[PDB]
Write a protein that binds this ligand. Structure first.
Ligand SMILES: Nc1ncnc2c1ncn2[C@@H]1O[C@H](COP(=O)(O)OP(=O)(O)O)[C@@H](O)[C@H]1O
Ligand SMILES: [Mg+2]
Length: 1523
């Protein structure tokens, strides 16, 4: 204590004038010191914001750095002999150390500068390397790689020469370079990179030990790759130099966006040569792009590094370099607890979320086989019956056909009051109230059609397809009128007439042939014929009301074009489109249908509008013509164009067809499909269903919005409807937890009754419901591990055989970010037909082979009986294709504020963009990318992507004329394609609108674009020239050709992708660097103000030295001090404003994605803050004073009327006698009870456009959910929720979080803040998707779940993904990447094989008989396991291929290692144990061959005959650690 603080002063004063300690008593010029440190290195003060936090943020982790810079300065400022002495400050020696400094700084003012500045710039680069703790990632695989990756070789060489950590193996006499080859052959072989290696050198700095052992490898790999190929040689390398140094490597580094792999440091130090000149690149990188650094650790695959932490800018200098618990709880405490709670389980799940509809379920009980008999027990002639049976129970005819006709009454009565309507007068618009009406009315009579305008007569069969037609046209042709039907409706009498006629055969022999004759004029002959009259009443009734829409759309669309024609241009066709698409929707009905005239109705109305709408003739004759076949069964021909019947043009900048294509998003989607069992839905089902109806395997790819999961509950429909005794199973995306709520909710579209326990669903292990209820039920819901144990697991075997049928979710999403071993196990083993669920998988074939294989192996094992029928595995893509990414397009447009703005913003105010969302147009459309990648995901959309791109492509690959497309047939090889892409884009579904088949154009024109790129920017490498067949390939003009189309790429391309994330992204960083530098113009100048020249013994200024310098901007504020792009909590300031403007472009619900957990809470908090603020800014007597006035005044008056009536009623008194004249009290009591008139002060306007506009759910329950939360209040969810801020994150109770989710789906709330889970095993409606940060992890894996999100189910036309969007480039590295592709793991695992061992040897324990059954089950099991054998990455390991057996060399080593081991249990004295010798009594007889050569079942037979037994105790207790 004392002694050490007597010491340190005596070291100091020797250097320079004695005492610091009292020369001066303070100083106090601290102020000099503190400037000098921080303006380089960080650590001086414990920097305080509002407050320092827990004071181990900057006690512990500060005082390292603080007393580092302290010591390492003073030791260097002790020079004049020694830098050989250490200076270490204690506590009270901090102040001392500073007094020692300040009185040395102003002592000389020359020597001081280098010994500080240099020491600083050294130590800074030391700390920058040390900035750190590290990460553990993981493996290599995730970011290793698409794309441009480098490793600079110097590093490469030292990676081979790296090891102790095992002294180097294999005796070789300095041929070592095999190392390089090995690593190359690892990560190209089963990875991508696109790899580049620099050799960035002479770095070296060798000898530190005799070398080199350099240029050997340099010249080697040079020669290898520049052979040109050899299939072992390629990577590829460049030259350069100049050492490290940038101003060389810049031009490269920019152009091909990458990330980096490099080796600072072990050891071998020496000091300055290594650490210095490697570290400083790292800094450089981070203050360019920013890129990031890895490695030199122990890769292949996973390593270190460092990231996404904020940098010190600038700081540089090159100047080195240099030349029982399931049981007993059911007994003790079960006196009354209370009396069971379980009643609080079932109830919860049975009130749980409502969303979707139904198909048939009722209680069933029976086991069904088919056979019927007389059971009377004869009749045995027909003359023993004569006449047999008659009408009775015929009341099912009587009433039902009365009711039928009573429809046509009501229908045409409702028609009456409508048809005349508000009869039209030219010109008034929009007026016209009944514009609204007919659209509603239409929907009504569509809802109604099922069972009270069509059948009470069965349908029946739905026949074969033409039957509906040919039995219709007949009926009309007997009746005098062309279109029979509605006017004078009811005509079921002349039906009966006709039906009796045509005697021999009743209806003539055509139709009863195809029906396989049922009833002659009895049941079926009536039931059918009825229903085909009758659909065609309903049909024509509606069809007329569709006419009446497109009819009066004429009028509303008149002045819409014409008034605005004068304006500048001639519109509306960007708003005039619904005319056309309505006229489409109308005539869309005809698909089987008899025309409803053309002399009144449909066609006449359509025609008048259509030639008025601009369309010159030619389009005319395509209309009637094609549809003529459809019409006919009815109609004649066509009017001439002559004789008033056309109208004014806009046309030609358009032409006909084009008018559609430019303006609109969204097309039909025609049903017709399956009508007994159905949804309808939209083809995918019409394939999928037929598999499960077999029984089988398969999987469905489906890129999301995807529809995937819900279609699996045909399994549950089968096992429930019919002989319920078999389990259906749904296996989760796993634990935690997300599966559970959805799984539960689905299955409770229809519970079902039983006898004594019985019971419907058991779950678990979880994170809800939680461990047990295990067993009894029909259908299950667990996770991989739970199910596994339940299988092997020897007492649960009973269950296994009763499982038909097992489906398990997600697929791709789990495969990547898991845990993608456990999967393989459960598709190798034991009964099922399976459905399985995946979004996109880029490798086809590879998947399907593995599957189909292991199906055939199951079939094999079940022999000789085989299966009942199926195996086989099917594999649904089957290809245009795409599923519900065809359904709607998703625009991506991204966040970037205009540099320099205000913030807060808020409400009841003018607004525009401003908003940071802008446009985008997908990042990169390029020359270089297209060569390799041509043309990658994610892109699709039309129109306005590839539409006007055509106009470019078609004007400049054809107008070349003709400079080197003339060698060889190149020019025509292109022009044979180009021209033809235009008709194929339209005339798939000509006449009205293309199907949805404007999609197909994208794939068409992908043959245009990518093909050119496979000529390209590169020479003869692609297409690869010399091969005889003609495109090129035998042109030496290939080079020329390549560079003719090189020109023809760039010119058109870069206009469209218009560089938003470059332009103002650099603007923001420009602002950042005018912001940061203004901080150094504060402190520098301020140091002179702190002392002031109101002081000091030098010439007076009287404080004319004050303020900043020297090129001057008004002092430091922008969008904030801390603007600070790509940084955290940047973000929040603008997120409020993003939101508010998305409500005031989009209108839908809004999800916000983030990383869970502290972060998500910080976000929520800040927004609640802002709103509470703005409420304080309304209530303080601005507009508010006026508002409250009214509401207060009128309330008074209300409650005074209460007292008014209370007076006049309280009279006093009827008097008509005496002399008072007439009066009777109380005669007026007609008024009245009134409520509530208002009072508000919780919240008004600033929160009321923040939360959703339109909503649902009666207020009672909403309030009561809030009420619950309030009691146990966690986050103060009670505050956040009611202010519109949804949440869903960890650290929230199950009851509370559950309340949130209902109210987002209920469309009560407007926003929600949560993590990535809500796109996975939970679901919500979305429209504007918001993403906060690109940190700390993304793969295109967990991107593409949220990518296709929005475009809601039958609702929204557009998804919107707004990115934040921290980095500059990484948009590209999400989008432009091709595909998340399978690449699994296994069985080879020790633990698996130990489990299998002990399973077999448990039945070996006392009690054999069943030995037979057991062992042959073990044979089957042994085959079933190791099914291929050998799965995915295991053939890239040590086997090759597909090999196995292979258990032998492991087995034997483990065999004499199981039980030798001392007392075992534990270290306590014998007995327990004394057995330690059992593993020598099985070794010799298992090493006969080593057991002992090829073929599966000789392995396990060899292992029938171990023992392989522990002392009992140990190996059991291994197996029971795991479970
Ligand atoms: N064939 C269909 N036609 C129209 N809407 C459908 C159809 N099938 C499903 N939907 C709807 O779309 C919604 C989203 O589909 P969904 O199956 O939940 O998602 P996922 O792709 O995650 O499996 C469902 O909630 C349902 O409303
Ligand atoms: Mg799903």
């Amino acid at each position: 204590m004392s002694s050490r603080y007597r010491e340190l002063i005596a070291i100091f004063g020797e250097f320079l004038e004695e005492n610091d300690f009292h020369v001066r008593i303070s100083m106090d010029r601290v102020g000099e010191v503190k400037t000098l440190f921080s303006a380089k290195t960080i650590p001086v003060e414990s920097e305080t914001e509002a407050a320092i936090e827990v004071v181990t943020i900057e006690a512990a982790r500060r005082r390292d750095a603080l007393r580092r810079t302290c010591n390492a300065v003073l030791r260097t400022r002790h020079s004049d002999q020694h830098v050989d002495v250490g200076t270490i400050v204690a506590d009270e020696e901090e102040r001392l150390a500073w007094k020692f400094l300040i009185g040395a700084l102003a002592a000389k003012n020359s020597e001081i500068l280098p010994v500080v500045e240099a020491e600083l710039l050294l130590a800074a680069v030391e700390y920058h390397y040390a900035t750190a703790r590290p990460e553990l990632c993981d493996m290599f695989v995730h970011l290793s790689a698409s794309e441009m990756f480098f490793i600079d070789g110097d590093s490469l060489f030292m990676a081979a020469l790296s090891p102790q950590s095992v002294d180097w193996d294999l005796i070789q006499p300095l041929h070592v370079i095999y190392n390089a080859q090995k690593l190359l052959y690892d990560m190209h072989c089963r990875g991508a990179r696109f790899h580049v290696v620099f050799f960035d050198s002479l770095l070296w700095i060798w000898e530190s030990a005799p070398a080199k052992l350099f240029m050997r490898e340099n010249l080697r790999k040079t020669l290898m790759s520049l052979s040109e190929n050899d299939a072992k040689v390629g990577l590829s390398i460049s030259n350069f130099s100049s050492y490290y140094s940038e101003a060389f490597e810049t031009y490269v580094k920019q152009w091909e966006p990458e990330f980096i792999l490099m080796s600072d440091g072990e050891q071998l130090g020496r000091l300055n040569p290594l650490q210095a000149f490697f570290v400083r690149p790292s800094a450089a990188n981070n203050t360019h792009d920013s890129r990031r650094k890895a490695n030199y650790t122990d890769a292949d695959e996973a390593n270190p590094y460092r990231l996404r932490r904020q940098y010190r800018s600038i700081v540089e200098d090159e100047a080195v370099g240099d030349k029982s618990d399931d049981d007993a709880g059911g007994n003790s405490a079960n006196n009354k607890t209370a009396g069971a709670k379980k009643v609080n389980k079932e109830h919860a799940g049975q009130r749980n979320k409502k969303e979707r509809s139904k198909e048939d379920e009722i209680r069933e009980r029976s086991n069904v086989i088919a056979a019927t008999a007389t059971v009377a027990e004869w009749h045995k002639q027909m003359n023993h019956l004569l006449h047999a049976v008659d009408m009775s129970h015929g009341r099912t005819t009587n009433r039902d056909r009365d009711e039928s006709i009573n429809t046509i009454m009501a229908a045409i009565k409702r028609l009456s009051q409508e048809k005349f309507g508000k009869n039209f007068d030219p010109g008034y618009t929009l007026g016209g109230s009944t514009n609204t009406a007919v659209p509603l009315k239409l929907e009504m009579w569509r809802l109604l059609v099922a069972a009270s305008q069509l059948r009470e007569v069965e349908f029946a069969f739905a026949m074969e397809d033409p039957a509906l037609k040919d039995s219709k046209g007949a009926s009309k042709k007997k009746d005098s009128k062309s279109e029979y039907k509605m006017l004078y409706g009811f005509h079921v009498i002349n039906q009966f007439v006709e039906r009796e006629a045509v005697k021999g055969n009743h209806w003539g022999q055509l139709d009863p042939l195809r029906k396989a004759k049922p009833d002659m004029t009895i049941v079926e002959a009536r039931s059918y014929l009825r229903w085909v009259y009758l659909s065609f009443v309903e049909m024509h009734i509606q069809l007329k009301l569709k006419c009446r829409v497109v009819k009066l759309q004429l009028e509303n669309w008149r002045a819409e074009r014409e008034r605005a024609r004068l304006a500048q241009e001639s519109p509306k066709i960007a708003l005039g489109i619904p005319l056309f698409l309505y006229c489409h929707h109308h005539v869309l009905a005809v698909i089987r249908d008899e025309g409803p005239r053309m002399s009144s109705e449909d066609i006449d109305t359509v025609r008048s509008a259509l030639k008025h709408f601009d369309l010159p003739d030619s389009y005319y004759n395509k209309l009637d013509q094609c549809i003529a076949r459809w019409q006919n069964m009815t109609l004649g021909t066509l009017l001439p164009s002559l004789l008033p019947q056309d109208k004014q043009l806009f046309e030609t900048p358009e032409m006909l067809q084009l008018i559609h294509m430019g303006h609109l998003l969204e097309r039909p989607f025609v049903r017709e499909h399956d009508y007994r069992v159905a949804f309808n839905p939209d083809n995918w089902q019409r394939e999928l269903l037929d598999i499960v109806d077999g029984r089988g395997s398969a999987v469905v790819c489906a890129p999301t919005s995807a529809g995937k999961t819900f279609i699996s509950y045909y399994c549950m429909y089968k096992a429930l409807r019919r002989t319920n005794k078999k389990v259906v199973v749904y296996l989760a995306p796993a634990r935690a937890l997300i599966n559970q709520a959805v799984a539960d909710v689905c299955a409770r579209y229809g519970s079902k009754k039983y006898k004594n326990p019985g019971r419907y669903i058991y779950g678990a292990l979880g994170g809800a419901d939680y461990h047990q209820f295990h067993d009894s039920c029909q259908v299950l819901l667990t996770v991989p591990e739970t199910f596994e144990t339940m299988l092997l697991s020897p007492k649960y075997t009973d269950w296994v055989e009763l499982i038909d049928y097992v489906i398990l979710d997600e697929i791709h999403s789990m495969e990547s970010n898991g845990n993608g071993d456990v999967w393989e196990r459960i598709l190798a083993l034991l009964p099922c037909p399976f459905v399985a669920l995946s979004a996109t998988l880029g490798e086809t074939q590879q998947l399907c082979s593995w599957l189909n294989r292991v199906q055939g192996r199951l079939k094999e094992q079940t022999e000789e009986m085989s299966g009942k029928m199926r195996d086989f595995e099917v594999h649904l893509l089957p290809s245009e294709g795409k599923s519900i990414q065809r359904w709607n397009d998703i625009k991506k447009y991204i966040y970037l504020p205009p540099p320099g703005a205000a913030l807060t913003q808020k409400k009841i105010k003018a607004q525009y963009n401003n908003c940071y969302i802008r446009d985008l147009h997908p990042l990169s459309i390029l020359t270089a990318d297209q060569l390799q990648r041509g043309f990658p995901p994610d892109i699709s959309l039309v129109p306005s992507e590839v539409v006007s791109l055509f106009e470019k492509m078609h004007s400049k690959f054809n107008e070349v004329v003709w400079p080197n497309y003339s060698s060889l047939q190149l020019a025509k090889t292109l022009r044979a394609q180009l021209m033809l892409i235009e008709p194929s884009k339209y005339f798939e579904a000509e006449t009205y609108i293309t199907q949805e088949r404007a999609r197909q154009y994208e794939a068409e024109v992908k043959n245009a674009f990518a093909y050119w790129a496979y000529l390209g920017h590169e020479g003869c490498e692609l297409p690869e020239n010399l091969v005889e067949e003609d495109l090129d390939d035998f042109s030496a003009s290939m080079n020329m050709a390549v560079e003719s189309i090189l020109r023809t790429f760039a010119q058109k391309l870069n206009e469209d992708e218009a560089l938003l994330e470059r332009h103002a992204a650099d603007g923001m960083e420009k602002k950042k660097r005018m912001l940061l530098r203004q901080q150094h113009l504060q402190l520098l100048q301020q140091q002179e103000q702190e002392n002031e020249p109101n002081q000091e013994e030098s010439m007076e200024q009287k404080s004319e030295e004050q303020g900043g310098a020297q090129e001057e901007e008004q002092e430091k504020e922008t969008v904030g001090s801390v603007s600070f792009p790509g940084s955290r909590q940047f973000i929040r300031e603008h997120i409020l404003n993003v939101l508010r403007e998305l409500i005031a472009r989009d209108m839908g619900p809004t999800i916000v994605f983030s990383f869970e957990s502290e972060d998500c809470g910080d976000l929520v908090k800040y927004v609640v803050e802002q709103l509470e603020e703005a409420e304080s800014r309304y209530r303080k007597t601005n507009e508010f004073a006026l508002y409250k006035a009214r509401i207060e005044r009128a309330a008074a008056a209300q409650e005074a009327r209460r007292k008014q009536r209370e007076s006049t009623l309280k009279q006093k008194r009827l008097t008509t006698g005496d002399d008072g004249d007439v009066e009777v009290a109380d005669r007026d009591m007609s008024d009245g009870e009134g409520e509530d008139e208002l009072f508000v002060v919780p919240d008004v306007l600033p929160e009321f456009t923040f939360i959703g506009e339109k909503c649902t759910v009666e207020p009672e329950v909403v309030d009561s959910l809030m009420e619950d939360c309030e009691k146990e209040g966690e986050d103060l969810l009670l505050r956040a929720l009611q202010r519109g801020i949804g949440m869903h994150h960890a650290g929230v109770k199950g009851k509370l979080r559950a309340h949130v989710e209902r109210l987002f789906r209920g469309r009560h709330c407007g926003v929600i803040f949560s993590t990535e889970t809500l796109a996975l095993g939970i679901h919500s409606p979305c429209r504007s998707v918001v993403l906060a940060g690109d940190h700390i992890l993304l793969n295109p894996t967990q991107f593409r779940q949220m990518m296709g999100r929005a475009g809601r189910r039958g609702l929204d036309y557009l998804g919107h993904l707004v990115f934040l969007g921290i980095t500059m480039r990484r948009i590209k590295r999400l989008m432009t990447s091709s595909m998340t592709v399978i690449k699994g793991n296994v069985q080879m695992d020790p633990i698996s094989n130990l489990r299998l061992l002990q399973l077999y040897d448990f039945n070996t324990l006392r009690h054999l008989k069943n030995e037979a059954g057991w062992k042959t089950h073990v044979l089957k099991l042994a085959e079933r396991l190791f099914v291929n054998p050998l799965f995915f990455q295991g053939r890239n390991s040590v086997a090759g291929g597909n090999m196995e057996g292979f258990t032998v060399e492991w087995l034997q080593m483990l065999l004499g290692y199981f039980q030798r081991e001392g007392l075992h249990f534990s270290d306590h004295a014998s007995s327990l144990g004394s057995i330690l010798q059992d593993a020598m009594y099985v070794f010799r007889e298992a090493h006969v061959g080593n057991e002992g050569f090829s073929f599966i079942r000789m392995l396990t037979s060899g292992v029938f005959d171990k023992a392989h037994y522990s002392p009992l105790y140990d190996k059991k207790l291994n197996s029971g650690v795991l479970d």
